[PDB]
Amino acid sequence: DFNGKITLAITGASGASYAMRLIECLIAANYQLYILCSSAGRIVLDTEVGVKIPSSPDAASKFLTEKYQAKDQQITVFGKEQWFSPVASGSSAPKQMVVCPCSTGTMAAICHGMSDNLIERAADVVIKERGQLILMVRETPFSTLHLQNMLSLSQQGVTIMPASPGFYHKVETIEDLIDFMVGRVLDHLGIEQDIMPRWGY
Amino acid sequence: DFNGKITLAITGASGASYAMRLIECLIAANYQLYILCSSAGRIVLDTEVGVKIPSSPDAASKFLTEKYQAKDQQITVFGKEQWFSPVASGSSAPKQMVVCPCSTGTMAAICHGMSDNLIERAADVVIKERGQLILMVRETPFSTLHLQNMLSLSQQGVTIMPASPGFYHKVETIEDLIDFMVGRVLDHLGIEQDIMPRWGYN
Amino acid sequence: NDFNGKITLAITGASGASYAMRLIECLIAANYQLYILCSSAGRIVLDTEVGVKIPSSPDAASKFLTEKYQAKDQQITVFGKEQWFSPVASGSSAPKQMVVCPCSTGTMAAICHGMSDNLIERAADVVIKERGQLILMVRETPFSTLHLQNMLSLSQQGVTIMPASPGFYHKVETIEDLIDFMVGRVLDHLGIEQDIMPRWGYN
Amino acid sequence: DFNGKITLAITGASGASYAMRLIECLIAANYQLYILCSSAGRIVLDTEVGVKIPSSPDAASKFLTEKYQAKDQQITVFGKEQWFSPVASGSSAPKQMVVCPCSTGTMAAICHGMSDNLIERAADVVIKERGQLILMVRETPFSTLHLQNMLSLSQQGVTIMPASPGFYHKVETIEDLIDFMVGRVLDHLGIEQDIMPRWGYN
Amino acid sequence: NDFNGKITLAITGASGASYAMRLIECLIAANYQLYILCSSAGRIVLDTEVGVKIPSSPDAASKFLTEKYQAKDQQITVFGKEQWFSPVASGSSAPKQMVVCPCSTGTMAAICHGMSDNLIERAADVVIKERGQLILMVRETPFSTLHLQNMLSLSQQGVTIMPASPGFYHKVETIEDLIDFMVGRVLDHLGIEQDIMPRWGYN
Amino acid sequence: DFNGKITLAITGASGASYAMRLIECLIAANYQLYILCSSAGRIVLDTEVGVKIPSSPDAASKFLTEKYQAKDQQITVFGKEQWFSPVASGSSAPKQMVVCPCSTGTMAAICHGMSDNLIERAADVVIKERGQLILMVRETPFSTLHLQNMLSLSQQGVTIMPASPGFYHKVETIEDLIDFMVGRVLDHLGIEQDIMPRWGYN
Amino acid sequence: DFNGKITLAITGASGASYAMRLIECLIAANYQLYILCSSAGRIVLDTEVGVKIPSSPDAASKFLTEKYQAKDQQITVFGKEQWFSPVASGSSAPKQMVVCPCSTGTMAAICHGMSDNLIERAADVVIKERGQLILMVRETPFSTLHLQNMLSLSQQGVTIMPASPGFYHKVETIEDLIDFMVGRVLDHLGIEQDIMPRWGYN
Amino acid sequence: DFNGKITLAITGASGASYAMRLIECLIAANYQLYILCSSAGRIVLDTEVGVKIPSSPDAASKFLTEKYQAKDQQITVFGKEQWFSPVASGSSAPKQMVVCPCSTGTMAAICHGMSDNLIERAADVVIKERGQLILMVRETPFSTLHLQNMLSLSQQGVTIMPASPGFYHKVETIEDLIDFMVGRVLDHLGIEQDIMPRWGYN
Ligand SMILES: Cc1cc2nc3c(=O)[nH]c(=O)nc-3n(C[C@H](O)[C@H](O)[C@H](O)COP(=O)(O)O)c2cc1C
Ligand SMILES: Cc1cc2nc3c(=O)[nH]c(=O)nc-3n(C[C@H](O)[C@H](O)[C@H](O)COP(=O)(O)O)c2cc1C
Ligand SMILES: Cc1cc2nc3c(=O)[nH]c(=O)nc-3n(C[C@H](O)[C@H](O)[C@H](O)COP(=O)(O)O)c2cc1C
Ligand SMILES: Cc1cc2nc3c(=O)[nH]c(=O)nc-3n(C[C@H](O)[C@H](O)[C@H](O)COP(=O)(O)O)c2cc1C
Ligand SMILES: Cc1cc2nc3c(=O)[nH]c(=O)nc-3n(C[C@H](O)[C@H](O)[C@H](O)COP(=O)(O)O)c2cc1C
Ligand SMILES: Cc1cc2nc3c(=O)[nH]c(=O)nc-3n(C[C@H](O)[C@H](O)[C@H](O)COP(=O)(O)O)c2cc1C
Ligand SMILES: Cc1cc2nc3c(=O)[nH]c(=O)nc-3n(C[C@H](O)[C@H](O)[C@H](O)COP(=O)(O)O)c2cc1C
Ligand SMILES: Cc1cc2nc3c(=O)[nH]c(=O)nc-3n(C[C@H](O)[C@H](O)[C@H](O)COP(=O)(O)O)c2cc1C
């Protein structure tokens, strides 16, 4: 039925709207989503976009499914230590994962392999199985230690995508900036998108 | 007269509006500016914000002065390879410099000391004189080599400041995101500002 | 405001609680405003080494310390473990000076690697990225290689690693003289006038 | 329509024949090409194989179209700083690029992310977007610094393919050596080829 | 011989002279034989911090310390700055255990880089090459990056870097309790039974 | 009572002229100096400028005091093992130090933390206390090991300022070269100077 | 008598022609050669150029002597583990050695000092005695690990000369490409050559 | 009847009188010079020493020829992309090259192998052919990135010779400082000179 499974982690960086719009576009492209959200991520979603994701995985899954009028099974949320989840094992996990937005703290944890929660274990799995991990980092300025951590991940095939949208297409609202970034994630995932033209400059 | 001199370099990355908004605020704050603009810079300023900066330094100074209604000598623009500029010698150059927006290619030339034009020499000088260089890099995703370049400069005390505006202050307009970044540049320069509040997270 | 400056002070679970308590006292006497963070291992060490039970709840702690030091109104605010709605948590708002004292090798390690897992680690990461001044008063001996790798990294990046190794070359009558050696060094580095450690050097 | 788009950049290293043959094979394989040529590249093409690429991009597109009897829009040449080309942006650029032949100076510029012209930007974009870049470097001997540069690009997923043809197959004429290299580039690009058989050693 | 083992003990010009004096006392009580090296900056610190004037001449120093500690015959021998005809100077002859205490960052640096410019540095270089145990009780704060680079190098190569950062989690009534914390740690690392620092850990 | 205290060490590199003139300017700028001089530096001073610094510290202080017509307490010299000097401890030492001229050997001692004499300890101190250390290194050519040493210091915030005078100003005389280096030192110290003009290139 | 002694090692990389031509030129330049051939080298010589080097060292010396019409003692072949050869000891070995052609596996063994056979020992001896070793490597594309290995040898004064002939001179036949490489090796060895002219680019 | 060929590059660092005195001595020692001058190097010679080198290469050869009363073919100036020059190919280039004065931007370009112009290609070729490159760097203070660039090249056998003259030989005039540096260059190149004597320290 679905076109593929993608793991999506939302962490406590600023940039909630990116994550909300990415999920909208993935659902519309008819992907199945396994969604992980950190406790700080929930705080940011509430403050920035007024979105309150219930803390219980079941209620969260139903909440998101209604928000996006998604199909049966299309969205599943897994809790912070739910090791039964498919994402926890290289024997079962999807091969694509996006962290959006991705805090420098979560980026750091994945860089060093702390694997202390489901989001960090999932990322560690995608890296070991040689899949695709994309981290949409939101911070500025960067410190040298942020850069060392990004460098290490990028050398190992992780895609560091800072939330730094461009303005060279006609930018007429905040949405168009949001769609710049989301369209780049989607191009990287190998998913047809029409939210960001291919005109170039 | 003025609270100080700042060197501003505009290069060909997207995010012209940041640079225009930065000039606007430094003028109102009564700083004197030495502005440098690469060719690709002007092309970006043109297509993104409809601002055709003349490529002659003298006409460029008058245009910007007029555009910002600046005082006499408050803005001086210098040419691609105009070595008499005060920015080209450690004996004379200002100690604060911002490259906004900063292409990955200019970041790279600065990283490695290419010093091939006035912008690159000007940055090399601030670095050797132990001044403050701030580079507003606008590119995504980063490649590994981007990240090696950035890490090398950052270790050497250059502030890598990617154009990654935050959204926690409540954004209703693109101008709030522009002001997010410009306000961070101003904080770093030690310039009082009220375009981005000090509330933090509420 | 109404104060000379703002300082962020984090207490973590290394031995050396008496250095932290003396440092707060001197900073208050100097009329600085303090944002205090304290980890739970931190409170355990305070409790066992100097008998000071800081309430775990941030309002109650602010009051407790305020009364302890007879501090002015809003001079001391404690913030809790994940209280992100705290000015220390954002570069838009935070103090440019922070001291971790005593700093456990675990907190130093989490700062070194950027873990930013609680308010203490985030506040440090912010100070680092904003190019402020972070001082870490590490208390541990011996060092391992990995401790040294972590301290080295931080020191290359402009973080001041100040082990709690007091000197004895001044008048040492009491333990208080050694506490004051280290607190005197922190104050000098913070740019704060102090008379607890004379400037005579070696005689 | 076409089987895919490829970016080709010709630079000022010896080995113009490799490039001309590579174009011939991609045209016959029904690929669409975006061709970039450096000024040194043009001088090399001229002196080595008598091929004079018009200075004008439109004139060059037609000249090559005509030379290879290529279909409509199958060959588009772009100029030195034509930032409006598809190749300059990650939102638009092809995911495969070859630099044939590749001078050590252009390999250097790409290694360090200098991105000063369309070739180096095109490269940097391919690298950041995680596509495939192949560099047919021609120089001998190598210096340590050449090797450092190749090393870092290689670690970053760029294919350093020196123009070092082998002789273990049927070597009669120079064309067999040219075809050795071109066939290796075609195998890497994933394109069906029979100018170099798969017998291996015999 | 007639002793439990041989230990090389070097005193250098860092603050912390009272750690060295207490360490000799415990080693003597434990019936170890000591080869003592003392630098001239070392004697200056001993003199100013604890009032102990070790004669610069090796015979006179051996007698002075022997009497100070009421040591047995040949239990303490001091050796002078370039006294190469000393068993510490050759791998064919030297003790396999050495402590520098207090260890200045200058002596740590000369050992790190292999300078071997006097008997102290040579004796350390020997212990290192013979795969023995070298403990360095560094006293300095803050650390610089270059200090940390030097300590890191040494620690990777199996040298124990033991900063003089005493803990407070045990019963601390006096300064002597903090001196005994560090001396207790040196003894534990040397494999020497000691009761000056209890083994109760944290309560 | 002076504008501040600076530590200045004179070591056995050629360039005694630069040291003598820095001292002149710092005295006229009303700074208090603590001077250290190596026995090799004393030999260089005697042979190059015929200045004979006496060996005893008290006689040294008086000699330099006399020579510069300095005020009371303005110049104090300290001997090579004079650990009572305020420069020996982070609890008491000035936050600015210059080694002029600086031999490759003393730069090496400082690079590696040898801290063998007062000059080396004073530098070690300034570094660990995060002050400002400036090393006017005179040597040519550099070896690789000299460069490794300077790179290590520079990465750690020490200013490696080779005695490499420029000629773009009005160079009528040797003093013009001495003043180029001295002026650059004083700018780094944050001390107003007018011996080297602040227009750059002309 | 002879102008000097050179060690030549042939290994199992493609490019046997380069080696045969190199020998021809050194013989005509009156050098004395100590030749080593690996078993893979022999297989390559056979399949590429029909040259069957006798398995026996004495038979190989005569076979080559005869092939090049060389003088008495001008060519001595030595076997795989003939440690009694001059080439195996630093007390005796020639100070110039070429490995032509050089497989990436023998370049690897030399990079890491494996010294398992006469070729690798000969190499290691040349390197330790600070003579000149040249490695004509033939492989494409390069892997990262190939590049790491070449890098470390290059940093250590070994000449990595890939078999990447250029085409800027008069290219008519394959012999002109062979002569390009051989002439570069002869220039490095310091030996007068006219198979590759010095006109440079025209 | 020239003793040898030297490539001499003049770049945009201060110290033009070094380069002019170096050509004088090399012409008196009967060496043949191939001189390259960048556009920033012209500007420096014009302003510092009042020498205006014509922009076209033939007029510039004639100009310098007359200036030093050089012999027929003793001096040839080559333009910034005159790739037909002997210096641009390893097959033909001189084995000794001096960059004097050397900017930090030209030192960087050579460090990372940019090879963007004839000066940078010439250097890249001297390095790959294992000749001798000497870089007379004039800048102070150095930044960490300057030091990283120098270190890399020195590790690779390039001689980093900063323009840091000594004073231990009795210094009459500025000329004695110029002659200190030029004598060191000449000593490095292996050319007898009597402008800086050999008595060392007295
Ligand atoms: C409103 C808000 C916005 C934040 N924005 C960022 C940010 O943009 N970047 C960042 O690195 N941390 C940010 N933080 C801090 C992280 O939330 C903090 O480091 C937390 O420990 C992250 O936890 P997580 O990585 O488990 O999500 C923010 C916090 C809040 C409350
Ligand atoms: C509309 C437009 C937008 C561009 N945006 C970027 C950008 O966001 N980041 C970047 O690194 N380069 C960007 N480029 C490419 C640079 O302009 C190009 O690499 C050029 O060589 C920069 O030179 P400069 O650094 O001298 O300005 C852009 C070009 C155009 C035409
Ligand atoms: C009484 C006591 C003393 C401690 N002393 C130290 C110490 O001196 N150094 C250290 O690194 N950790 C010490 N610890 C361990 C830390 O408390 C432990 O590593 C903890 O996880 C640190 O957490 P924190 O960094 O969040 O405060 C001590 C613990 C206790 C209970
Ligand atoms: C006829 C000719 C042949 C050349 N061959 C080579 C070569 O094989 N390798 C190389 O690295 N450079 C070679 N060059 C030099 C490059 O052309 C030079 O470094 C130039 O600056 C490269 O510019 P580009 O990288 O923009 O093409 C050659 C030059 C000419 C004129
Ligand atoms: C009273 C006094 C206390 C000192 N304290 C220290 C210290 O605690 N740490 C340090 O590295 N050096 C200290 N020094 C400096 C060393 O004595 C100085 O670096 C000396 O050269 C060390 O020589 P040594 O390593 O040969 O003993 C002190 C000096 C004096 C006079
Ligand atoms: C006349 C003279 C000039 C010297 N010039 C230099 C110099 O320019 N650079 C240098 O590194 N060493 C120079 N030296 C050598 C240093 O003096 C020597 O290495 C000494 O050991 C350094 O001692 P110091 O670092 O304690 O002062 C010179 C020596 C003499 C006698
Ligand atoms: C016909 C033929 C051609 C070969 N060409 C190459 C080559 O060009 N490059 C290479 O690295 N190995 C090549 N090999 C593989 C090497 O022969 C192989 O790695 C062998 O183990 C090398 O042994 P040697 O290094 O002792 O000569 C070739 C093998 C054969 C049979
Ligand atoms: C009068 C004058 C003096 C200069 N001196 C120096 C210098 O001493 N060192 C330096 O690195 N750059 C110096 N520059 C800057 C270089 O000329 C500049 O970075 C230029 O881009 C170098 O280009 P080139 O390397 O192609 O010659 C100077 C410029 C002028 C106008």
Residue numbers in the entry:
A (entry chain C): 4 to 204
B (entry chain E), D (entry chain F), F (entry chain D), G (entry chain F), H (entry chain A): 4 to 205
C (entry chain B), E (entry chain B): 3 to 205
The authors write:
In prokaryotic organisms, several ubi gene clusters encoding a set of enzymes (UbiA, UbiB, UbiC, UbiD, UbiE, UbiF, UbiG, UbiH, and UbiX) produce ubiquinone from its precursor, chorismate. The monomer structure adopts a typical Rossmann-fold topology comprising eight α-helices (residues 19–32, 42–52, 60–71, 89–91, 107–115, 121–132, 147–159, and 177–192) and six β-strands (residues 8–13, 35–40, 78–81, 99–103, 135–140, and 162–165). The monomeric structure of CpsUbiX is stabilized by two different patches of inter-subunit contacts, namely patches 1 and 2, to generate a dodecamer.
FMN-bound CpsUbiX crystallized in the orthorhombic space group (C2221) with 6 monomers in the asymmetric unit, while FMN-free CpsUbiX crystallized in the cubic space group (P23) with one molecule in the asymmetric unit. Electron density for FMN could be seen clearly in the subunit interface region of the complex crystal structure. The FMN-binding site is surrounded by the α2 and α6 helices and the C-terminal loop region from another subunits. The C-terminal residue, Tyr204, forms a stacking interaction with FMN. The phosphate group of FMN forms three hydrogen bonds with Ser41, Ser106, and Thr109. In contrast to FMN-free CpsUbiX, the FMN-bound CpsUbiX possesses a sharp turn at Ile198, causing the C-terminal end to point toward the interface between neighboring monomers, where FMN is bound. The charged surface is more prominent in FMN-bound CpsUbiX.
